[PDB]
Design a protein around this nucleic acid. Sequence first.
RNA 1: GUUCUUUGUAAAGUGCCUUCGAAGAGUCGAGUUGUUUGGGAAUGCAGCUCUAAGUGGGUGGUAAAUUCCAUCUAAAGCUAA
RNA 2: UUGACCUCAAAUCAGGUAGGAGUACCCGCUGAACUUAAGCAUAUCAAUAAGCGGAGGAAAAGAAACCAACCGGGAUUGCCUUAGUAACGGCGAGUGAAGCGGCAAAAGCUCAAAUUUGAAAUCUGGUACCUUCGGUGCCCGAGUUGUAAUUUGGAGAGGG
Lengths: 203, 58, 51, 148, 193, 99
Amino acid sequence: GAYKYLEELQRKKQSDVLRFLQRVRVWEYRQKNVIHRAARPTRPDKARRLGYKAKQGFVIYRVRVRRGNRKRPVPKGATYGKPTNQGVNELKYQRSLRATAEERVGRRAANLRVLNSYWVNQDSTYKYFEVILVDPQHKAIRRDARYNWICDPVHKHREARGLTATGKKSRGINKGHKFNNTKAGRRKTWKRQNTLSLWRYRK
Amino acid sequence: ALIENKKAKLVLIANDVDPIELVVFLPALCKKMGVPYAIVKGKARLGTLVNQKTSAVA
Amino acid sequence: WRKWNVKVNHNEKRYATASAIAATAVASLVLARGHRVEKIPEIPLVVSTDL
Amino acid sequence: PSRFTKTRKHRGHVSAGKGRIGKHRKHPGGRGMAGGQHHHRINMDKYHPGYFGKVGMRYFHKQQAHFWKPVLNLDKLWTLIPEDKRDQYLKSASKETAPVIDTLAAGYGKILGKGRIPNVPVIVKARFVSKLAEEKIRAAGGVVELIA
Amino acid sequence: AISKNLPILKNHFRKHWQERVKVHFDQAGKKVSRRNARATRAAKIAPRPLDLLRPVVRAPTVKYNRKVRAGRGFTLAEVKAAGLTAAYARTIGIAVDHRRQNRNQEIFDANVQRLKEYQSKIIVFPRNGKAPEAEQVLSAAATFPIAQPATDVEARAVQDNGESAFRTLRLARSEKKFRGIREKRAREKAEAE
Amino acid sequence: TVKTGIAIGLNKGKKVTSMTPAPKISYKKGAASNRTKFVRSLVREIAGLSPYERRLIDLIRNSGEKRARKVAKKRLGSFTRAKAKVEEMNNIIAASRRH
RNA sequence: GUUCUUUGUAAAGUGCCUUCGAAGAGUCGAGUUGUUUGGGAAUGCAGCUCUAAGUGGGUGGUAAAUUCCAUCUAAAGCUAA
RNA sequence: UUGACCUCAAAUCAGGUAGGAGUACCCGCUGAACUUAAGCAUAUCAAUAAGCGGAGGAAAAGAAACCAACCGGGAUUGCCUUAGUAACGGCGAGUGAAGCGGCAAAAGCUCAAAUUUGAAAUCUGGUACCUUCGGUGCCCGAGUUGUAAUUUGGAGAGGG
């Protein structure tokens, strides 16, 4: 029953009680490495909602990432083309900031499999996220068919391919009309919609 | 759940929860229901009372 | 992508098959194809079902 | 087939049917639909009047099933009745036995009064009908039964 | 470019369209492969007909509301109406739709009697019994055809009332059209004291 | 839902004997409950109000009601959230005024 | 198909009455910018700033205010052909 | 003084795992210009080539915060069709979907949020034996900041 009070307060981020908690927490995160082990989920109602269990083989890692735009990596703003491709600064990186935060942990703890992630804090410079890991090599996850799926070799680096909640959102994977151009994948639609079909007895 | 069901008559609470949000409501539940509580020092001492390492409540 | 198969009206395939069926009972046409049917008693050649 | 085209007859002849002065070139007048409001105007104006501009108002998210209303004309009205099942109705203009023709079961959303039905009474079940269509059926003696 | 008296044409070939070209030269090859897997499964599940009993369902989209057609599942009200549990019916070749809801009795009872006819004509074998051979058929959709309901009787009387059934359509649209203003004018007229 | 039997009009469509089927439980997913109301109550008690939430009580007390929503229209995303967020604050005013 | 173990003082389904029925947040959503789309007073996506809710919320392809109605349950997850 | 907790280290500590190759087909990320517009800059090539990350035998998607406005349909995928259409567009050049209908294949579902509180029942690992893709006995540890049992909205739970 504890999580129900954890759930509701944790949404009251702009109250004087969490603004003290928020302000203090961000300082110690900024006092540690850009990406590191977190001792435990600071938001147990959030981690366990996202598939986390307090069992031997679930791993916690906090991440921080730089914020703002993506400046186009051209020397001296030299694009060498038409006026419409002359922008260098206002470029926004179609992939999300937690999506780029999961990849660095997956690179870091490569023998792990990322489950999901969530925001913990932020400042002007660093956006902060906790990332929930899981170890297919650990016997406490190999069994328990609740969590044996993550052990299948088709689930390596789920975030880099974009199979987490971050990617499926960035990739625009949702049902209905507002997702026509990317419903089963934007490229696969384009290739299917831009292929000409011919039969033996041509129609 | 015990506090909500009025099934408590003295609550021991550790002051040393690293996430404080786990307990900030515990003194608040106890008064509104009417349960008396004692915020006592030490999880490691509320732990051995439970034969655990930490309990954060008793 | 070349056009290999050619679609033919269904009725014409039925038309042409009936023409090549009606042409099997013309000994003039069968001889023209060189089928050596000079000594056949008569055509069409129908045999008992025991074949 | 290749053996019938005039390419077989243009072997030996220099220009291959393209001229010596003209000198058949890549895209002498521009590709595609260039020059509509320019050097090709006289062609577009004489053959494609209306090709430029706009005429009316737009319509987002069209699906062509709300305007679906296939038309059956009053000339026939009878190909729906079975062939061998027809002639006994046309010869007997009998009341309280008249046929029911459900145009929807045929697949027609509207009936219009093209002309000259036989004077036998018939019952027609139609989503919509034309004005002159409805009394011509009724002046024969029948009635139209609106359906949805 | 533009030339002799010809229609305009929109031919979409200005991309590298030459690599995304399909010519199924397999049309006959896929057909035989379908007919092996169609039978290979039929051997593995031997008695069963390779498909689920599908219901009879009236199509959407007024263009096609006029015909009826096979649906996806049997609308839990249906499986409970015919006296059977969904977790078991899914083991008896019944397709059940947990997300479709019945709204028409004539459609409703059709699925009930469809499912009742299905129960009579099937043979369920015991988990430990002899399980005698029963000469499978390969389709429930064939054994229980989807038949269009009969609408009218071929002979009826003539009932003329003088309404002419065209004014009815003219009056109707005026009712859908002008209703708003005379119902708003109804309020402001009633606003007098 | 009484169809008129004609393809047009107010209630266009063919009349059919309806059923009014069983209620779908996934309509009160957003309807409050006993555990919901109680925990939501005590959180507001132990957390307080937001910096923008305080400016809502300040303006509603001083200069009236109409602009209370107008500042709530921008400060909140939608307008429909602005009307609700104001009524959430009037309840706070009534609660404090009684005490 | 043959045979040995009886799993179990266990598990599942089913009628009527009563009390409940927790359903996900730096998330939804809004503005602005950029890019993207066939998506039009803004199709998705991402950047910043703001940042809710519980008869609520998302959608219903012309913006906004008011009144209705329909259909689903996001911010969590697996799955052959 | 001694024994814990939290947090952080070290070890050629016990057991593992990532890398690299290949990469036609898939999932992303970045991203042109040649060209067409009889010039050309928005536009087009093209949401493409090149560049980078990440898999499988297929991948991906997938059981509606869907489609529709009907007498409602009912995961996803693919075919035919809608359609060179609605729409976009120096409204020029040009671009350009989806619902509806028939077919192939069809299969469903499960977590969070609930005191077992008349009993951590749970899980890793270590050691001995045995019928070893493992079972049992015993022993530290994970675990009360929640591991097992119970239920997923189509429901369901506590009582009669």
